[PDB]
Design a protein around this motif. Structure first.
Motif: not given
Lengths: 95, 206, 125, 60, 78, 149
Positions: F15-17, F19-28, F56-59
């Motif tokens: 249940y991961n998209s 958007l929330v993949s990055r909203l909780i993790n990733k990149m940084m 997020m979509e623009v990202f």
RNA sequence: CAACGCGAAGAACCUUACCAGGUCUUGACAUCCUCUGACAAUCCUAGAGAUAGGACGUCCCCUUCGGGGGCAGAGUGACAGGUGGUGCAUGGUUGUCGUCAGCUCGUGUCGUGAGAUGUUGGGUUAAGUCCCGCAACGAGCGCAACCCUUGAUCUUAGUUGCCAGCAUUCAGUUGGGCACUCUAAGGUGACUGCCGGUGACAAACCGGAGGAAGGUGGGGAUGACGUCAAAUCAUCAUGCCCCUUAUGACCUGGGCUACACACGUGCUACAAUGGACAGAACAAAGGGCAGCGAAACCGCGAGGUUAAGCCAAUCCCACAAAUCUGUUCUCAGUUCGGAUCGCAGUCUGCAACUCGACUGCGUGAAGCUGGAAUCGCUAGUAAUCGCGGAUCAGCAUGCCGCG
């Protein structure tokens, strides 16, 4: 009665502690077990060579350890029999 | 770049310190007088020969055990001499001392005794070839598992020194389970300085 | 009424969790002020979310050793152990994601000659 | 010239400052460890020999 | 530089003091440049060892707080 | 030798998209933790304000814009040092494009970091940005030297 | 490469050898020879050695008492001193190629001889690791393991630790209990063990599962035969010379810290992923008896006063910082940077000018990402952030170690 003992080698200290508790038990006394008090290391550093090469080094440790015993009841009629035990010089003993 | 000392490495895991006393706040002076008595007894028993001497502490009373069969001969005739010398140790230590003599049977496989043998044979003008080649087989038939012995210095060819060693047997130095006893000795000659290093594989430990 | 031991890196978290309503505590204190990171607010609930056991427990923790992220990993390990003690039926599913291996990751010995753990001194000719 | 100022070290100086420390077995003035009153060369020597009851070649 | 006052050695101090009393004329020898300068020895003259040779110096009214060492540069230069 | 790889900054499995993949993790990938997971998560809301849609979509739209699909490395041949076009692996794509965004964000220069980064995210959502500029310069270099295989 | 934050894990004196000056001669130091018998220390002027002399001012154990033992003093000739040379006279140590995978011998064969074989050829791994052939068959030193240490857990042990359930508290300190952690001993453990495939079936390799850990788990210790006449005469000793009224010695001061420049290794920055102010935190491994030094009071500070406890899983060193939250600052040579300066202090030490550190003021420099070139780093690494520790009165941006 509290009693503290320590040495440089667990090999001598364990047999020391077991003998102490056994002679305190078979000659009746009420006693606590040989809790191992945490050991403390002490590192030393030294150059391999006499004149050069500080990048060369070896490490020495005066690795020492502690044990603790206490007798619940002093039992004067048996602690006096306990006192005359003999141990190696590698172990220290005190009240 | 040379090897680590094998007994230097094996101390405390398969070998005891040969100074079995605990001290604290007295470590420095206890150690110092240990070296002093070691030096004294080694100097004055060199002729009789002795390999290793352990020291033990109790109630501020030092006590000693001393090795080799020749101090066995010092027991009988030197029994008076044992008391006479240990009087000197009493005087040095301040507090009186106890001693014991332990006989090393089969001296052919004690490193220090072998080293002293080689040193003497060298210093009384015998050739390193004869001395070393004879001693190795002496120890082997005495029943060691392997021997390597080495001498260095101005080996007769006084104008330049070199190194030489003989060996026959199995002698693993890198394994930390063997019982490679080690010794070394210094031999002074007219044409320079001679050093000796001998060690023997006795057996593993289990 | 369930217990587990949690170790991450110079840090030991010993968790005891009880059936409840999603109330989370560490050292009789709340986490929203103890740990500010949201990536470590998701710490506690990650295992409880890759299983469906999200809100039906509240947790009490006594934790010691290490810093904040190490403590977070210690939580993860300890609560994983406690949950396994609770119900090993989906032990395999929890393994599949992981969150059970005590990562042996620990600070490497600083050795002489080198600077730091691996940084050799500068070299010129 | 070593004997003269090892004797200086032995005798007490005129001030509590001057009493520097020299290693006692081998007269090096530098790098003694107070716990043994010994310096590295003749410390390592008898360390490998076996003395210093409690110390071992360290490793970790 | 402490609460416990300036530091000076007696073997200098007495012979400069009785000098200032009886006769302020002749120069005074000293191998010790350690002593702090004191306010009641203005105008005297002291020969201070520089390592090689004692350097005579004259003392002004404002030479207070310093030490006689400050006026005996012991290292040569260009 | 041989190939090697790893994965991290993982969001939850199910249940991961994105958007929330990055909203909780990733990149940084800017430095130590903190001053990230912060100076970020707020860059996104300022552009929720600056654009009337999901920030997020623009990202990842700007990401798609910045992605190259060819580039060129250097090879020693004779005495020319020919520039040889090559392709980009699916992960090399993402790492290098993200890298361009972050380094240009810290290069461009305005009052502060999060507005810098947000302005570049929109300047790459639109196809007029500094990182995108380097993207087309690498591209024109590459297919100007397409001949070399 | 493998010298250049190296011998030095610490230079105000001391260290310390060198320089100027002042001084001594069997000499501080060691054994022998004869005496005086037990010999010293405090204080006085010159004083720096040391000397002139002083006020008590040279005072033991055994001795059928002859005289011995040790203790110093005097004289005494043999002697002592060499951090004085020679690492191309050496020992003993250490670096380097290199933790690279090689280096050898026994016996036997081929060659005539230098020699070859084994040690090559197939794959294999990190490996001369293993298996398969092969005039080779074996063995030894190397590799691996045996060792230490970190990773999961069982038994024993619960105090100075830990407080699950209870009453209590700000002092989970108490009462009570070893539940849990933790502590430290003994075992379990991972061994290609098991399954499929590849490979001749072998060796092995790939993928699974169990598993805390899967393919030498991680790291440390271990450094073959030898090359560099590599370094050390500064621990040691033939060799020569220096003499003992001097290169041997004692004392004061100076130096090793100099400074027109060059290089190496590091610390601090050049700014807003920042400065400043306030609040909220999380925590190693070590050290502490001529020691650690609590609390309170004094000073805006370095520190001082009087000091509880701790010979330490009890007390102390010791309020880990980075970090999170909030206020201001608004892009500047700036509230960045803090250099260098004058003033005023604290500490230690007899002593802080040459030549300590720290602190309050005032000051505020260059510097706004560094040419040509060049270095370290394969995940708890680099990068940052602090915390201890040897050296020791004071002296750390160095080193060692810890998170």
């Amino acid at each position: 009665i509290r009693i503290r003992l320590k040495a440089y080698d667990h090999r001598i200290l364990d047999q020391s502690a077991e003998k102490i508790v056994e002679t305190a038990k078979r000659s009746g006394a009420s006693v606590s077990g040989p809790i191992p008090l945490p050991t403390e290391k002490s590192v030393y550093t030294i150059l391999r060579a006499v004149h050069k090469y500080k990048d060369s080094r070896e490490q020495f440790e005066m690795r020492t350890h502690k044990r603790l015993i206490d007798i619940v009841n002093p039992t004067p009629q048996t602690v006096d029999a306990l006192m005359r035990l003999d141990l190696p010089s590698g172990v220290d003993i005190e009240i | 770049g040379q090897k680590v000392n094998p007994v230097g490495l094996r101390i405390g895991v398969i070998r005891d310190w040969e100074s079995k006393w605990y001290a604290g706040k007295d470590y420095a002076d206890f150690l110092h007088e240990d070296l002093k008595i070691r030096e004294y007894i080694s100097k004055r028993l060199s002729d009789a020969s002795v390999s290793k001497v352990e020291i033990e502490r109790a109630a501020n009373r030092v006590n000693i055990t001393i090795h080799t069969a020749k101090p066995g001969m010092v027991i009988g005739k030197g029994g008076s001499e044992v008391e006479a010398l240990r009087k000197a140790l009493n005087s040095l230590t301040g507090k009186r001392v106890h001693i014991n003599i332990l006989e090393i049977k089969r001296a052919d496989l004690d490193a220090q005794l072998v080293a002293d043998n080689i040193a003497r044979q060298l210093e009384n003008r015998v050739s390193f070839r004869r001395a070393q080649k004879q001693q190795i087989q002496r120890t082997m038939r005495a029943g060691a598992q392997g021997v390597k012995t080495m001498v260095s210095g101005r080996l007769g060819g006084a104008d330049i020194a070199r190194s030489e060693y003989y060996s026959e047997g199995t002698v693993p130095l890198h394994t930390l389970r063997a019982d490679i006893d080690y010794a070394t000795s210094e031999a002074d000659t007219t044409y320079g300085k001679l050093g000796v290093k001998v060690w023997i594989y006795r057996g593993e430990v289990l | 009424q369930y217990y587990g031991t949690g170790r991450r890196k110079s840090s030991v978290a010993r968790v005891r969790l009880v059936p409840g309503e999603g109330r989370i505590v560490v050292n009789n204190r709340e986490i929203s002020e103890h740990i500010p990171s949201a990536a470590l607010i998701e710490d506690i609930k990650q295992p409880l979310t890759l299983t469906e056991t999200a809100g039906t427990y509240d947790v009490l923790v006594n934790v010691h050793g290490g810093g904040l992220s190490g403590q977070a990993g210690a939580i993860r390990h300890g609560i994983a152990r406690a949950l396994l003690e609770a119900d090993p039926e989906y032990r395999t599913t929890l393994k599949r994601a992981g969150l059970l291996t005590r990562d042996a990751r620990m600070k490497e010995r600083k050795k002489y000659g080198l600077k730091g753990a691996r940084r050799a001194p500068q070299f010129s000719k | 010239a070593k004997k003269s100022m090892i004797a200086k070290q032995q005798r007490t100086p005129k001030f509590k400052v001057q009493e520097y420390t020299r290693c006692e077995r081998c007269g090096r003035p530098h790098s003694v460890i107070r716990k043994f009153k010994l310096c590295r060369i003749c410390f390592r020597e008898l360390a490998y020999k076996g003395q210093i009851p409690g110390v071992k070649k360290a490793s970790w | 530089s402490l609460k416990k006052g300036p530091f000076v050695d007696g073997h200098l101090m007495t012979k400069i003091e009785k000098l200032n009393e009886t006769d302020k004329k002749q120069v005074v020898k000293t191998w010790s440049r350690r002593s702090t300068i004191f306010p009641q020895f203005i105008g005297h003259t002291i020969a201070v060892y520089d390592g090689r040779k004692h350097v005579p110096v004259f003392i002004s009214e404002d030479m207070v707080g310093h030490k006689l060492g400050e006026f005996a540069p012991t290292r040569t230069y260009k | 030798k041989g190939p090697v790889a790893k994965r991290d900054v993982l969001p939850d499995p199910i249940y991961n998209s994105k958007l929330v993949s990055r909203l909780i993790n990733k990149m940084m990938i800017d430095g130590k933790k903190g001053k990230s997971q912060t100076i970020l998560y707020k860059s996104f809301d300022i552009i929720k304000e600056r654009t009337g849609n999901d920030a997020m979509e623009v990202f990842e739209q700007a990401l798609k814009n910045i992605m190259p699909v060819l580039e060129v490395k250097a090879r020693r041949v004779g005495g020319a040092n020919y520039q040889v076009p090559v392709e980009v692996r699916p992960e090399r794509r993402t790492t290098l494009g993200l890298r361009w965004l972050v380094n240009y964000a810290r290069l461009r220069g305005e009052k502060t970091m999060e507005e810098r980064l947000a302005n570049e995210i929109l300047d790459a959502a639109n196809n007029t940005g500094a990182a995108v500029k380097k993207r087309e310069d690498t591209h024109k270099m590459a297919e100007a030297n397409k001949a070399f295989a």
